[PDB]
Scaffold this active site. Structure first.
Site, PDB file in Angstrom:
ATOM      1  N   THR A 129       6.428 -22.694 -20.722  1.00  0.00           N
ATOM      2  CA  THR A 129       7.601 -22.014 -21.293  1.00  0.00           C
ATOM      3  C   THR A 129       8.802 -22.940 -21.159  1.00  0.00           C
ATOM      4  O   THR A 129       9.480 -22.943 -20.141  1.00  0.00           O
ATOM      5  CB  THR A 129       7.858 -20.660 -20.619  1.00  0.00           C
ATOM      6  OG1 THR A 129       6.720 -19.839 -20.752  1.00  0.00           O
ATOM      7  CG2 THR A 129       9.004 -19.893 -21.268  1.00  0.00           C
ATOM      8  N   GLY A 130       9.041 -23.796 -22.146  1.00  0.00           N
ATOM      9  CA  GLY A 130      10.149 -24.762 -22.123  1.00  0.00           C
ATOM     10  C   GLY A 130      11.466 -24.207 -22.658  1.00  0.00           C
ATOM     11  O   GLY A 130      12.455 -24.927 -22.715  1.00  0.00           O
ATOM     12  N   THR A 131      11.475 -22.956 -23.101  1.00  0.00           N
ATOM     13  CA  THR A 131      12.578 -22.301 -23.808  1.00  0.00           C
ATOM     14  C   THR A 131      13.704 -21.837 -22.886  1.00  0.00           C
ATOM     15  O   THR A 131      13.582 -21.880 -21.668  1.00  0.00           O
ATOM     16  CB  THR A 131      12.064 -21.121 -24.628  1.00  0.00           C
ATOM     17  OG1 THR A 131      11.688 -20.046 -23.812  1.00  0.00           O
ATOM     18  CG2 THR A 131      10.870 -21.495 -25.506  1.00  0.00           C
ATOM     19  N   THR A 132      14.852 -21.466 -23.452  1.00  0.00           N
ATOM     20  CA  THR A 132      16.065 -21.190 -22.676  1.00  0.00           C
ATOM     21  C   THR A 132      15.925 -19.977 -21.777  1.00  0.00           C
ATOM     22  O   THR A 132      15.384 -18.946 -22.167  1.00  0.00           O
ATOM     23  CB  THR A 132      17.323 -21.094 -23.549  1.00  0.00           C
ATOM     24  OG1 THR A 132      18.437 -20.910 -22.726  1.00  0.00           O
ATOM     25  CG2 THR A 132      17.332 -19.940 -24.533  1.00  0.00           C
ATOM     26  N   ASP A 181      14.239 -15.964 -23.961  1.00  0.00           N
ATOM     27  CA  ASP A 181      13.662 -15.608 -25.253  1.00  0.00           C
ATOM     28  C   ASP A 181      12.140 -15.377 -25.139  1.00  0.00           C
ATOM     29  O   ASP A 181      11.328 -16.296 -25.155  1.00  0.00           O
ATOM     30  CB  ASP A 181      14.014 -16.631 -26.322  1.00  0.00           C
ATOM     31  CG  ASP A 181      13.395 -17.996 -26.067  1.00  0.00           C
ATOM     32  OD1 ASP A 181      13.305 -18.406 -24.893  1.00  0.00           O
ATOM     33  OD2 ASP A 181      13.000 -18.641 -27.062  1.00  0.00           O
TER      34      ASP A 181
END
Lengths: 249, 246, 212, 90, 239, 184, 186
Positions: free
Chosen positions: C27-30, C45
């Site tokens: 999970t590289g997302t913000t 997100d």
């Protein structure tokens, strides 16, 4: 070390009346086990107690236990202990070959067994085994029959015939009259006949109670069935009738 | 090396465990009842002094959000088993299956801990009998008793401690297979009213239930999948309100 | 015992010798945090995790490791709450999470933003996979963190209410947007339950046999 | 070597953390404190043998301060005569 | 304390054997096409949960069952060890465990608890049951000593002697599983301390083959199924 | 060299192993393994397997099915790699299932990959054996047809690799247990 | 023996499905829960042994079979244990809650991250050809016969249409009280 030898009355040291003496008492109460050498075989024989009517014969264990393709062990005393004592010897022999490119020698299968029995004597409030054994077979690349006895103390000895358990005095007395060490039974059949005669004097009823394993050179291990030992028993009983009727009066 | 404890007496008895059941038989009574839609476990709090604050001495304990426990016997032995029982539920089952263990698997594990204390040198068996009560999706509601021996039993109702034989006779006389959780609470409050050593009110009495899920007590919203604690420990005001209906 | 290295050398020969080792999901997302008036908002997100009812996290890096550590520490926090008879403090979870991430030397690839309410108040911290820690009124991790932090700084003020914190949270997430792609948020407020808000924004030959 | 960086550290972690703790108690409280704590652990370890149970001991978790804490080593764990003749010496 | 009596006999084993001689009766019978196990359960408690799934009778794997006389706390330690060994054999060999290998496995653990003085022995006697291709339907017994024996029919626990005599006169080598149902129920009704046999006092099970050639099936009977074999057999405590 | 070949027939399993120790171990009266690989690890692994199946056979007075020896061999092969960089090993187990009267053949790779086969090979072969086998192979092939298929197969291997491999040892498992058969 | 291969999983009204490549099924079962494993064949078989063991012990200890969601947590927590050297696999659990009747499918990376798609799941190398086919052919709430039709045509179409003589597919169609295994050949 026992009986009437007593200086200024007496008092006990650390000594004779001991756990190992009571293990010897357990061994004497277990069924009769016998072994005799021959010219080129060794036969081990045992007393079954006469099986109960509801007991299952086809799965009942053969009392004489194969430790390896050339070594056989039988016992008197505690069965549970002998099962734990045969397991150690079997894995010890299979491990021997795996680490020495050599099947276990009969004398190393006797020093190991009596050796482990001696460690449960030595100390610790772990009891000695209530078991005495016959260990028999051949070494590899040899034709000499071997037969050893081991005792709960971890003492062991070689015999050309021996008996352990119940009534074994009377059997050893018969063997001393019928086994000649100069001319032992020259053939397997005579060796088996001698063990059936030896056991017939001490067993409960007859052919039910005897069971034998014949060891021969080159891993030729062979249990005899009930039907094979019934023809030995019958032949010996025929010769008794013949000897009695050959009375001259 | 002549080393063990709880060896066999010649009549085929374990001896030390028998003395451990005499310590259990001396404790303040605890009891448990299983109903059609819930379960109840209950006990009295005996003060060493009226200066003691028995909001600190909990006797009824949460093992998992659907499993409760109570004791009779030595309370110190019970504080140490309850924390091993909690550790067991998480380490053996929740961390492998992502769900808490049933009330038959946790009772087996508590009993395994008490059996290991009988079969040892160096250690005495426990001085406690434990009542463990709970719910699971496939077994449903359950109640079990565990003794110093490591023997465990499924019960419909039971009692342990001083008043236990009179409690067990009342539990046989009153139990029926169609009880509901408000009924079982009344029977349990009636049973402790006979066994009480001291005063009877909401402050001296411990009472817990495993009942319906309570989504209020989960303390976070947004996940219906998580139903919320079945185990609820009755507040001292609820106990006094039910003790006004008595 | 614990996480084993059984096939570590076995898989050092499989990748060398042309089996594609399966991709660990990441999970590289913000992910963001908001120490808002009388509480603390966090958002991402599947991605928001609970150490206890009042303490929650958002995770980045390896998905299995963010779940795994938050569930291990959630077990220790639950047991400690049962042992001490007190609600579990965010500083206690932070100590456990950070001290556990250090034992594993960043081979457990969980990067974590931790928030909650406890009897002391409302707290917000973030731990990197080598077991080292930040504190602030607002924090962000993952690839959109530059842009998210620019939006967090540009609008935060003391006495930010729930609604305004939830707007800033959602705008710092949508400033990370141009796996994942719509907001989950949880709001921890000092007297109240953690409010969690999901998505805030004849052909062939047949033979057959019956089986059990 | 080809062997994972973390392997030798995590193998010896339980021993290392107690050995390091005992040296801090020697330093801050004097030789009596680790002499007391090692003898309590000796009585608990040496008087608690049961060939069929390997799942630790209840009093050792009280002594070690592990009574409300789980490691991966407690959720992921890993002959009676061979145990007997190790406990007594062969 | 695991020391010999001066006769070469173990006091602790004899006292464990006194303990199991009180511990409720169990019968097993080996028919030509299946094994029957039955056990009598002293339900002196009304509030004890009958319709609990086990007490005396247990599964060890998909084709092996046991009956217990003795302490259930002791039995459950051995039962789990046997279950672990059965699955560890299946994992190793891809094949179901032979009954002799498992019965004697539990006989080797129970001997060890009789030799070392720190351990008390286990107060349990097991009447094992199962099927495998090496032999067929097998019935074994094992006791606190670590002795084990093969049988066609056997009792353990209380009233062993009366039960063995009743088995011996009615057992036939060619009987069917339904004849062994009848026999085990008759034997227990002819041996019981309680006034008459009933479905909650009785634990029952069978190891039949069924209709389908690859099957062997171990119905550990629920109370309602036991009520049917009771009313069919003529024990028939029926309205 | 270190080639192994396999041609199981209607009522036998034929194991052919390269001439040099045989590198094929009698595990029981009705089971052979053949093996190929890094000469230290495989010889020692085969003796460990043989000592464990001999110990089982003595401890039971019984035979171990060709399945059960094979899954034991895969489980021990896999268990030996859980602290080790994989050694080059291939195992070809052939035996006779005396409780169902079927000959059986199994191949195990270095990773521990069981496959139950009609025919198999390893060590020093390509599609030339596999094509030659698949054209001629039959479910009901006789032992004499199998020995001829093995001779064709060894001839195809010889023609493609004219160096001296000193022929191969052929061994058969059937109702009569292990027979060493002379072939050239 | 063939390394890799594909598994596909799909939900219908009170039913599930698990397609797979033959020519040794990838798809095992433990009572009513089905596990399709792709990847290295040694790990597929070692995991079969490991889950057979764990699930037989579960059935023995717990007096009931392991449910699809519980088995999902067990496979992920078992796979996670192997963290530094994992199983080279893509497991796909399936099964119908025996107490609810709801379809379940889930799949995992080599250390156990849980996907729980309510429609369909894919695993194996070159997944994204089938991911497009399966997204094209799927619709919600099918009957079992149409559910078989959509998964079988997905397998056929995404199949290598050059080697269709080497083909063979097993489709388990799983229902509440019934399981049908269709083998399928061209």
């Amino acid at each position: 070390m026992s009986g009437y030898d007593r200086a200024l009355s007496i008092f006990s040291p650390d000594g004779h009346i001991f756990q190992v003496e009571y293990a010897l008492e357990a061994v004497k109460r277990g069924t009769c086990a016998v072994g005799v050498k021959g010219k080129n075989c060794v036969v081990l024989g045992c007393e079954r107690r006469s099986t109960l009517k509801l007991q299952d014969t086809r799965i009942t264990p053969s009392k004489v236990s194969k430790i390896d393709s050339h070594v056989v062990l039988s016992f008197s005393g505690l069965n549970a202990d002998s099962r734990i004592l045969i397991e150690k010897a079997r894995v010890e022999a299979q491990s021997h070959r795996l680490t020495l490119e050599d099947p276990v020698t009969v004398e190393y299968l006797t020093r190991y067994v009596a050796g482990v029995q001696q460690r449960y004597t030595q100390s610790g409030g772990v009891r000695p085994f209530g078991v005495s054994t016959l260990i028999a077979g051949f070494d590899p690349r040899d034709d000499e029959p071997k037969l050893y006895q081991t005792e709960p103390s971890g003492i062991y000895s070689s015999w050309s015939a021996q008996t352990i358990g119940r009534n074994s005095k009377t059997v050893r007395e018969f063997l001393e009259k019928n086994y000649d060490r100069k001319e032992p039974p020259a053939t397997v059949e005579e060796c088996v006949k001698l063990t059936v005669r030896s056991l017939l004097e001490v067993v409960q009823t007859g052919a039910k109670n005897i069971e034998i394993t014949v060891v021969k050179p080159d891993s030729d291990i062979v249990a005899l069935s009930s039907e094979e030992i019934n023809q030995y028993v019958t032949q010996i009983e025929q010769e008794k009738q013949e000897q009695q009727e050959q009375d001259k009066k | 090396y002549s080393f063990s404890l709880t060896t066999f007496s010649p009549s085929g008895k374990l001896g030390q465990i028998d003395y451990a059941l005499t310590a259990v038989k001396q404790g303040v009574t605890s009891l448990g009842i299983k109903a059609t839609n819930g379960v109840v476990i209950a006990t009295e709090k005996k003060s060493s002094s009226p200066l003691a604050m028995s909001e600190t001495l909990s006797k009824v304990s949460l093992l998992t959000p659907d499993i409760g426990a109570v004791y009779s016997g030595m309370g110190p032995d019970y504080r140490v088993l309850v924390d091993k029982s909690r550790k067991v539920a998480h380490t053996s089952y929740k961390r492998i299956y992502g769900e808490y263990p049933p009330t038959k698997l946790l009772v087996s594990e508590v009993a395994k801990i008490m059996q290991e204390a009988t079969q040892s040198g160096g250690v005495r068996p426990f001085g406690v009998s434990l009542l463990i009560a709970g719910h699971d999706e496939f077994n449903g509601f359950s109640l079990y008793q565990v003794d110093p021996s490591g023997s465990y039993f499924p019960w419909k109702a039971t009692a342990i401690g001083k008043g236990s034989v009179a409690a067990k006779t009342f539990l046989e006389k009153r139990w029926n297979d169609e009880l509901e959780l408000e009924d079982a609470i009344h029977i349990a409050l009636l049973t402790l009213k006979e066994s009480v050593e001291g005063e009877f009110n909401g402050d001296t009495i411990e009472l817990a239930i495993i009942g319906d899920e309570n989504p209020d007590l989960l303390g976070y919203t947004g996940i219906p999948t998580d139903k919320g604690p079945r185990f609820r420990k009755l507040t001292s005001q609820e106990i006094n309100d039910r003790l006004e209906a008595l | 015992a614990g996480l084993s290295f059984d096939n570590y050398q076995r898989n050092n020969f499989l990748a060398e010798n042309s089996h594609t080792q399966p991709k660990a999901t990441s999970t590289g997302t913000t992910i963001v945090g908001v120490k808002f008036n009388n509480g603390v908002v966090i958002a991402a997100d599947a991605k928001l995790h609970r150490i206890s009812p009042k303490i929650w996290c958002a995770g980045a890096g390896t998905a299995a490791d963010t779940e795994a550590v938050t569930q291990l520490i959630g077990s220790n926090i639950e047991l400690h709450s049962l042992y001490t008879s007190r609600e579990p403090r965010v500083v206690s979870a932070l100590q456990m999470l950070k001290q556990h991430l250090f034992k594993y030397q960043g081979h457990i690839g969980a990067y974590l933003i931790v928030a909650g309410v406890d009897p002391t108040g409302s707290h917000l911290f973030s731990i990197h996979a080598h077991g080292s820690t930040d504190v602030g009124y607002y924090l962000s991790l993952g690839s959109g963190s530059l842009a998210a932090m620019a939006v967090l700084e540009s609008h935060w003020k003391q006495d930010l209410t729930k609604e305004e914190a939830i707007k800033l949270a959602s705008d710092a997430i949508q400033a990370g947007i141009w796996s994942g792609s719509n907001v989950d948020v949880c709001v921890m407020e000092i007297g109240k339950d953690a409010e969690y808000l999901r998505n805030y924004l004849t052909t062939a030959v047949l033979k057959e046999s019956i089986v059990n | 070597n080809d062997r994972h960086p973390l392997e030798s550290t995590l193998k010896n972690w339980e021993t290392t953390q107690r050995q390091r703790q005992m040296e801090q108690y020697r330093q801050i409280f004097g030789i009596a404190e680790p002499m007391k704590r090692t003898m309590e652990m000796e009585i608990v370890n040496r008087t608690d043998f049961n060939p069929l149970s390997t799942n630790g001991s209840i009093h050792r978790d009280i002594l070690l301060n592990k009574e409300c804490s789980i490691d991966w080593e407690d959720v992921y764990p890993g002959d009676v005569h061979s145990k007997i003749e190790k406990q007594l010496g062969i | 304390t695991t020391i010999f009596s001066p006769e070469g006999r173990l006091y602790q084993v004899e006292y464990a054997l006194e303990s199991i001689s009180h511990a409720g009766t169990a019968i097993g019978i080996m028919a030509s096409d299946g094994i029957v196990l039955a056990a009598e359960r002293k339900v002196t408690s009304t509030l004890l949960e009958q319709d609990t799934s086990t007490e005396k009778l247990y599964k060890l794997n998909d084709k092996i069952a046991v009956a217990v006389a003795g302490l259930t706390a002791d039995a459950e330690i051995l039962i789990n060890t046997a279950r672990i060994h059965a699955q560890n054999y299946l994992k190793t060999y891809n094949e179901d465990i032979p009954v002799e290998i498992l019965v004697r496995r539990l006989s080797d653990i129970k001997q060890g608890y009789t030799q070392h003085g720190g351990l008390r022995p286990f107060g349990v006697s097991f009447i094992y049951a199962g099927y495998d291709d090496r032999y067929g339907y097998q019935l074994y017994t094992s006791n606190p000593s670590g002795n084990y024996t093969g049988w066609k029919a056997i009792s353990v626990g209380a009233n062993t002697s009366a039960a063995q005599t009743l088995l011996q006169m009615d057992y036939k080598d060619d009987m069917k599983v339904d004849d062994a149902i009848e026999l085990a129920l008759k034997t227990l009704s002819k041996t019981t301390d309680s006034s008459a046999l009933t479905y909650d006092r009785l634990e029952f099970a069978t190891i039949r083959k069924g209709a389908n050639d690859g099957e062997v099936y171990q119905k550990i009977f629920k109370p309602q199924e036991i009520k049917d074999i009771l009313v069919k057999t003529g024990i028939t405590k029926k309205d | 060299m270190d080639i192994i070949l396999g041609i199981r027939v209607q009522d036998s399993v034929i194991l052919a192993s390269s001439k040099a120790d045989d590198k094929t171990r009698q595990l029981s009266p009705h089971t052979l393994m053949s093996f190929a690989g890094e000469a230290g690890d495989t010889v020692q692994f085969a003796e460990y397997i043989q000592a464990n199946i001999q110990l089982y056979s003595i401890r039971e007075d019984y035979e171990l099915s060709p399945q059960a020896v094979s899954s034991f061999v895969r489980q021990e092969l896999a268990k030996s790699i859980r602290s080790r960089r994989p050694y080059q090993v291939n195992v070809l187990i052939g035996g006779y299932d005396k409780k169902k009267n079927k000959p059986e053949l199994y191949q195990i790779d270095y990773l521990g990959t069981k496959v139950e086969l009609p025919y198999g090979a390893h060590g020093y072969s390509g599609f030339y054996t596999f094509s030659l086998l698949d054209h001629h192979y039959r479910p009901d092939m006789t032992t004499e047809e199998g020995l001829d298929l093995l001779k064709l197969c060894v001839q195809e291997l010889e023609k493609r690799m004219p160096m001296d491999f000193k022929g191969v040892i052929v061994k058969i498992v059937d109702k009569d247990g292990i027979r060493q058969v002379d072939d050239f | 023996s063939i390394n890799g291969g594909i598994v596909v999983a799909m939900t219908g009204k009170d039913c599930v499905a698990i397609a797979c490549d033959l020519r040794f099924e990838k798809i095992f079962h433990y009572g009513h829960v089905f596990l399709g494993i792709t990847g290295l064949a040694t790990d597929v078989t070692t995991l079969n042994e490991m889950f057979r063991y764990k699930t037989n012990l579960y059935k023995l200890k717990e007096e009931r079979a392991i449910e699809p969601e519980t088995f999902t947590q067990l496979v992920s927590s078992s796979l996670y244990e192997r963290r530094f050297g994992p199983y080279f696999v893509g497991p796909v659990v399936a099964g119908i809650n025996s107490k609810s009747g709801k379809p379940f499918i889930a799949g995992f990376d080599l250390i156990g991250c849980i996907d729980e798609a309510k429609d369909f799941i894919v695993s194996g190398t070159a997944s994204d050809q089938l991911f497009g086919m399966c997204e094209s052919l799927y619709e919600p709430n099918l009957e079992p016969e149409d559910l078989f039709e959509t998964i079988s045509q997905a397998l056929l179409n995404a199949a290598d249409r050059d080697a269709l003589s080497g083909w063979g597919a097993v489709v388990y169609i799983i229902k509440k009280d019934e399981v049908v295994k269709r083998y399928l050949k061209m």
